[PDB]
């Protein structure tokens, strides 16, 4: 495979699957490497742990461990055997690193890679009153039940809703009033993180939901830009199996389309069919999807060498 896997401490399937995803997001990994970690206190520094884990996934010829990283979380070894949601970790972990990157040479990285903005439009139906709200996002929750594929999922997302009845809009001086609400994307980030809502109330929606290897999302912007069309290429499929369960990540790291499967310590080659179509579901299916913006793939997935790992870090890591 050319790539190393990661040891399962017990239930760290979620972490290993994300650690691989965040590792192969090369621009992030370079950024983690360039973080000022003066050795701090190891069992206290999440960036140091991320640098350890990232360094060995780049160099080791045997499965890498996660002990120190879960240590740096403030966790005991029993917490390593509770099962967890991969997207909750990502929210918690990337928020951690984002603030730990402030005031250092790598401020802005996580939002520059992952953060987009959306606009919510609200207009009253029986009074002249309109409102707007612009909110940033690091991920998109896509509905699944009743939608055959990702295209129908963004249509629903941007569809127009009726704020009615027990959900009338608080139109200020006009009081509670019926209204229409609509969402649009102002910007989509270089690395798109899609959380498929494979859950109804936990029942877990195992239905067939199809995602593609290319995704044109220009239809869901507010203003399209012809100097950077919004085509995204599929990079990762974080597959969940269960109801608790197991987590695996399928990845074409180089964006070339030669995929591998990452099941904790075992890294396999595999076919497109095995990573995309076999994961539409209908117990095993995609839960999270990583698409990278075609215009930005060269930068995001630029190749990473020992020339990108600061020397002070190697000396810290080696002498340890």
């Amino acid at each position: 495979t050319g790539y190393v896997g990661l040891k399962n401490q017990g239930a760290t399937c979620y972490m290993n699957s994300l650690l691989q995803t965040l590792f192969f997001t090369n621009q992030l990994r370079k950024a983690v490497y360039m973080m000022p970690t003066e050795g701090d206190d190891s069992s206290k520094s999440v960036p140091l742990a991320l640098q350890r884990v990232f360094y060995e996934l780049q160099h080791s010829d045997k499965p890498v461990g996660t002990k120190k990283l879960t240590k740096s979380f403030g966790w005991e070894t029993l917490d390593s055997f509770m099962q967890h949601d991969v997207q909750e970790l990502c929210r918690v972990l990337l928020d951690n690193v984002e603030n730990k990157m402030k005031g250092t040479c790598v401020e802005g990285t996580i939002p520059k890679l992952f953060r987009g903005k959306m606009v919510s439009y609200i207009q009253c139906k029986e009074v002249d009153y309109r409102s707007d709200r612009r909110e940033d996002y690091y991920d998109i929750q896509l509905s699944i039940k009743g939608k055959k594929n990702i295209f129908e999922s963004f249509v629903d997302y941007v569809a127009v809703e009726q704020l009615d009845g027990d959900n009338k809009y608080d139109a200020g001086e006009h009081g509670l009033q019926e209204a229409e609400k609509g969402v649009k994307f102002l910007t989509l980030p270089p690395v798109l993180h899609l959380q498929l809502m494979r859950f109804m109330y936990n029942i877990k929606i195992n239905d067939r939901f199809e995602f593609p290897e290319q995704l044109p999302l220009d239809e869901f912007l507010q203003k399209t830009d012809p100097k950077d069309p919004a085509n995204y290429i599929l990079h990762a499929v974080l597959v969940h199996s269960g109801d608790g369960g197991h987590y695996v990540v399928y990845l074409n790291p180089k964006g070339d389309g030669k995929w591998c499967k990452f099941d904790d310590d075992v890294v396999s080659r595999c076919t497109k069919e095995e990573a995309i179509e076999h994961n539409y579901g209908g117990c095993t299916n995609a839960y999270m999807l990583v698409y990278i913006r075609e215009s930005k793939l060269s930068e995001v997935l630029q190749a990473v060498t020992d020339h990108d790992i600061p020397q002070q870090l190697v000396e810290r890591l080696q002498e340890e």
Partner: protein, 75 residues
Amino acid sequence: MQIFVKTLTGKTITLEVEPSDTIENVKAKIQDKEGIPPDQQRLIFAGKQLEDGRTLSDYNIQKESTLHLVLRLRG
């Protein structure tokens, strides 16, 4: 104030909340309107998952802000 909560169906429901409210207070109002037991709610705003203990003011959450409700797939 009236904020917005996108549900597990993707539909926007209105929620009546106070800058004072803690996230457990918000989660209970959601249970009161959507039936989701708080022990299973995960609420996402601007890519932050809101923590039991902090309040809505600590996230600059205000009128017409939108929360995204999500459950867990553990593994």
